[PDB]
């Protein structure tokens, strides 16, 4: 290794005696496939050094002498290249080296090898990719080159259908990690010519600016498990998961599924409005002819609460297991579960005959209408700007409230201790808050117990609560006036995609079957989806 | 409107507002102009929870108004660049 590890071009002249000095002399164990044991470069060996040095004669000589090509480096900020000499050559843009490594170097390398994680060269190229305009060209060029060469060498195996150790493929791995640049290229691979079979888009006809294409569909949820549509929507922690859903193969597919399931959305909306009206009417007409209807209303409310609780439970601990929270996009499922639990908790007290049921029955009424805003997503385009909520209030408003509560309680305790409350601090605490939203009461105590000393301290609480509000407003404005983007269409489309993917399964009591999109077309010896596209940017 | 009606009917059902819904709706709306009451009375059996409902109502109203103001500011930022004189000329 130290002989190879050099920067001079002439150091290849000293390995010539060493080739046969150790080869034909003892060495029960092999001579050249030695690996480092430093626990950070376990398996680095000597071939990796030769390949990394941008050298071609050294790697030729080592392979000729009998070096092993299937040697993996383990250990190790790390540099992940695929843990294989072929993957290392591919990732470093060495066409001459990679061609020789698998064409005929004696004991040729395999294009379908693993690296103890299930990844192959195609997985490694996707994983190291980037959204930068420079790396994308290299990744696409090498991916296409290796794909073309695989058919030339071994056309009996599909390199792009080899599963990872997590059940993933390069197409799905590019979607989970968020590599949009290599994802879009894979979805729209043309390859017109002798390499037509290894393509995914088959243009049908073109006339003027109009084109008609047939996209291949290995990314449809129906008749598939762990499909690309679920990975891009559920098992994806990336900020660009919304920009990967407006691509041409997916946009029309989601639109034709949303148009099919738009009646059930409003049917559920109506079935929820009727339930809320009945609940409000029953709650208003408290017991403290018409006596028979009250029992029926209570039974209906209990049944509705049980149904909602069962639905939310089946959603949580039976389908979206291993949620891992990530980012709280399920902002309304928790509220639905809370309302469903509170309703049944309030209604179960009839057997207990406890007067404490009245407050809870009120709370379920407050959340119910508050949950009605959930359905404001399919109603026209309403919801494109409704997503301007819960942007930073999850973080900024939390700190604002934490500071405000401390500044409230400290001043309240100070006012109580200094002094017109007598023994209770609740009165002063509520008066301090009423001084903000309402009118309040500003006076010199009760002209007793010294008095007047407490007034000077009150002049600072108002200033603090004013400046905190000003800072919060400034932060909110500075997060909106600048950094403003028209990327709302993508957010609304992602919300509609999630809703469509949820409604496709059906209800927990009547599991509806699946429906496959596209027709079983054939292009040569393949389900396809026809998309028209009009673009007046010709030339 | 739906927020105000839901809170008013909840407060009416809980027994601070009193009697019917229209007067309760007036009491809830009065908080928006600036004047409000938070004494929550003392003869009410279910006190405290009324205070929680009022706090939730005022917080929701404030956040809704802030979001509306932000949307108005964002909209006015866009179409202010070079359309002041032309509209007046078209009206003339």
From TrEMBL, chain B:
The chain crosses the membrane at residues 1-14, 44-65. It is found in: Cell membrane. This is Transient receptor potential cation channel, subfamily V, member 2. It comes from Rattus norvegicus. The gene is Trpv2. The chain holds residues 545 to 664 of 761 of the full protein.
């Amino acid at each position: 290794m130290k002989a190879v590890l050099n920067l001079q071009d002439g150091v290849n002249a000293c390995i010539m005696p060493l080739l046969q000095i150790d080869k034909d002399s003892g060495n029960p164990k092999p001579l050249v496939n030695a690996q480092c044991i430093d626990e950070f470069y376990q398996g680095h060996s000597a071939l990796h050094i030769a390949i990394e040095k941008r050298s071609l004669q050294c790697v030729k000589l080592l392979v000729e002498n009998g070096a092993d090509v299937h040697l993996r480096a383990c250990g190790r900020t790390c540099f992940y290249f695929g843990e294989l000499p072929l993957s290392l050559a591919a990732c470093t843009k060495q066409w001459d080296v990679v061609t020789y490594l698998l064409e005929n170097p004696h004991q040729p390398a395999s294009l379908e090898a693993t690296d103890s994680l299930g990844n192959t060269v195609l997985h490694a190229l996707v994983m190291i990719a980037d959204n930068s305009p420079e790396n994308s060209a290299l990744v696409i060029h090498m991916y296409d080159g290796l794909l073309q060469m695989g058919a030339r060498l071994c056309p009996t195996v599909q390199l792009e259908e080899i599963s990872n150790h997590q059940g993933l493929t390069p197409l799905k791995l590019a979607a989970k990690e968020g590599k949009i640049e290599i994802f879009r290229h894979i979805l729209q691979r043309e390859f017109s010519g002798p390499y037509q079979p290894l393509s995914r888009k088959f243009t049908e006809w073109c006339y003027g600016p109009v084109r008609v294409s047939l996209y291949d569909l290995s990314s449809v949820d129906s008749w598939e498990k762990n499909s690309v549509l679920e990975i891009i929507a559920f098992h994806c922690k990336s900020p660009n998961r919304h920009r990967m859903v407006v691509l041409e193969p997916l946009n029309k597919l989601l639109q034709e599924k949303w148009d099919r399931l738009v009646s059930r959305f409003f049917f559920n909306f109506a079935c929820y409005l009727v339930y809320m009206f009945i609940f409000t009417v029953v709650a208003y007409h408290q017991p403290s002819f018409g006596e028979s209807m009250l029992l029926l209303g209570h039974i209906l409310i209990l049944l509705g609460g049980i149904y909602l609780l069962l639905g939310q439970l089946w959603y949580f601990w039976r389908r979206r297991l291993f949620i891992w929270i990530s980012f709280m996009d399920s902002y309304f499922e928790i509220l639905f579960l809370l309302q469903a639990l509170l309703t049944v908790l309030s209604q179960v007290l009839r057997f207990m005959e406890t007067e404490w049921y009245l407050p809870l029955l009120v709370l379920s009424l407050v959340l119910g209408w508050l949950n009605l805003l959930y359905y404001t997503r399919g109603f026209q385009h309403t919801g494109i700007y409704s997503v301007m909520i819960q942007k930073v209030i999850l973080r900024d408003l939390l700190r604002f409230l934490l500071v405000y509560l401390v500044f409230l309680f400290g001043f309240a305790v100070a006012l109580v201790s200094l002094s017109a409350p007598y023994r209770s601090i609740l009165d002063a605490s509520l008066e301090l808050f009423k001084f903000t939203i309402g009118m309040g009461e500003l006076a010199f105590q009760e002209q007793l117990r010294f008095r007047g000393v407490v007034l000077l301290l009150l002049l600072a609480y108002v200033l603090l609560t004013y400046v905190l509000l000003l800072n919060m407003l400034i932060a909110l404005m500075s997060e909106t006036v600048n950094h403003v983007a028209d990327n709302s269409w993508s957010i609304w489309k992602l919300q509609k995609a999630i809703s469509v993917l949820e409604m496709e399964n059906g209800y927990w009591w009547c599991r509806r079957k699946k429906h496959r999109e596209g027709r079983l077309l054939k292009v040569g010896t393949r389900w396809c989806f026809r998309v028209e596209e009009v673009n007046w940017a010709a030339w």
